[PDB]
Amino acid sequence: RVVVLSFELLHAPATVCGPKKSTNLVKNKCVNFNFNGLTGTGVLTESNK
Amino acid sequence: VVNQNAQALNTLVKQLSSNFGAISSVLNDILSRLDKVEAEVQIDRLITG
Predict the structure, then answer these.
(1) Nearest CB to B28: which of A9, A10, A39?
(2) Which residues of A have a CB under 8 Å from any CB of B?
(3) Are A39 and A32 in contact (CB under 8 A)?
(4) Residue B49 to residue B46: CA distance in whole angstroms
């Protein structure tokens, strides 16, 4: 028996993700972040966009 | 003189979005997807470009 898990990554919002728990949201401090597999390091701030 | 220097910096910043023949422009995405031995083969093409 064979199963082939093809998967796609960049093109759209995430739809399937790993089990790892979401944190509380930190604002107005330099932090690493992950939102739906968009990742980086930055200060996060309350937008008006 | 203002416009030339602004245009040179815009060209420099837009060049970060180029793959240079790597699987992605995004360095953290390569490092998130691949383990070290295969990641560094992609990182070297981004470094060169």
Answers:
(1) A39
(2) 9-10, 39-40
(3) yes
(4) 5
